């Protein structure tokens, strides 16, 4: 299938004392493979998947240097944006950055992205053509002009369409045993009698990878949305994911309802029904 490499960066200023809390996480698809945490002792980019440990000392020195460069930029930005928004020095603020690249089944470049937020709101983002910027407000507009004059988009494009795609392909190969393995959901259904006339059917999907999945209820062969509940997909903690969907039904009518499961790891969609 298609694949992605994504990096997520968060800095939170500490007005009370010291430098911002800085946390970087790297993903291939839904697999975290590196992290940097300013609160950790190592002060190094650290491995979080076995297949990245194949990389030698030069890799780790380079990623450490570069991710520390990210943290300093974030620190400087927190100061700059505080001024742009005329904010006090007393408050804590947050900067968030995410960027990365998608490749298709053929591992050819598909898309690139780079977005930036201040205090949880869009600040500036690279457009889909990777040639121009979306600035949410007049502060971000100042940044946009600065980045245009310095041709940041062009430099970013060289990474996103070039180096980023080459890294992703390197990782997919090195980690193929897991990265290219699909874990179909382990499914089952539970039954809970809430009262004497209603029952809840819950359709479970467990231990699947990647995270993308569709759970739908049908009644007599038609999609049921009324009286259903779907939880957000959640990590199992072992690299796989979980999800469930439930429907309230009249007692004795359970047989009418079917749960339908779609996942890349499934050759055909699954259908479950309480009988």
């Amino acid at each position: 299938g298609s694949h992605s490499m994504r990096y997520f960066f968060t800095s939170v200023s500490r007005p009370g004392r010291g430098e911002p809390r800085f946390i970087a996480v790297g993903y291939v698809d839904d697999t975290q493979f590196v992290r940097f945490d300013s609160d950790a002792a190592s002060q190094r980019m650290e491995p979080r998947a076995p297949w990245i440990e194949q990389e030698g000392p030069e890799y780790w020195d380079g990623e450490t240097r570069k991710v520390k460069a990210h943290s300093q930029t974030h620190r400087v930005d927190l100061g700059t944006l505080r001024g742009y928004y005329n904010q006090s020095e007393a408050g804590s603020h947050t900067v968030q950055r995410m960027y990365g690249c998608d490749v298709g089944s053929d591992w050819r470049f598909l898309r690139g992205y780079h977005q930036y937020a201040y205090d949880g709101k869009d600040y500036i983002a690279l457009k889909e053509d990777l040639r121009s910027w979306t600035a949410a407000d007049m502060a971000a507009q100042t940044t946009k002009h600065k980045w245009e004059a310095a041709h940041v988009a062009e430099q970013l494009r060289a990474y996103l369409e070039g180096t980023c795609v080459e890294w992703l392909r390197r990782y997919l190969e090195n980690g193929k045993e897991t990265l290219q393995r699909t874990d179909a959901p382990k499914t089952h259904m539970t039954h809970h009698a809430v009262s004497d006339h209603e029952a809840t059917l819950r359709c479970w999907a467990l231990s699947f990878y990647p995270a993308e999945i569709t759970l739908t209820w049908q009644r007599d062969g038609e999609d049921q949305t009324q009286d259903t509940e779907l939880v957000e997909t959640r990590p199992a903690g072992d690299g796989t994911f979980q999800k469930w969907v439930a429907v309230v039904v009249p007692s004795g009518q359970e047989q009418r309802y079917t749960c339908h499961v779609q996942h890349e790891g499934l050759p055909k969609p699954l259908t479950l029904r309480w009988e």
């Binding site: 600040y123 310095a150 430099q155 180096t163």
Partner: peptide
């Protein structure tokens, strides 16, 4: 691997 540049805002 992360981007080699990190321009300030």
């Amino acid at each position: 691997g992360v981007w080699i540049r990190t321009p300030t805002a």
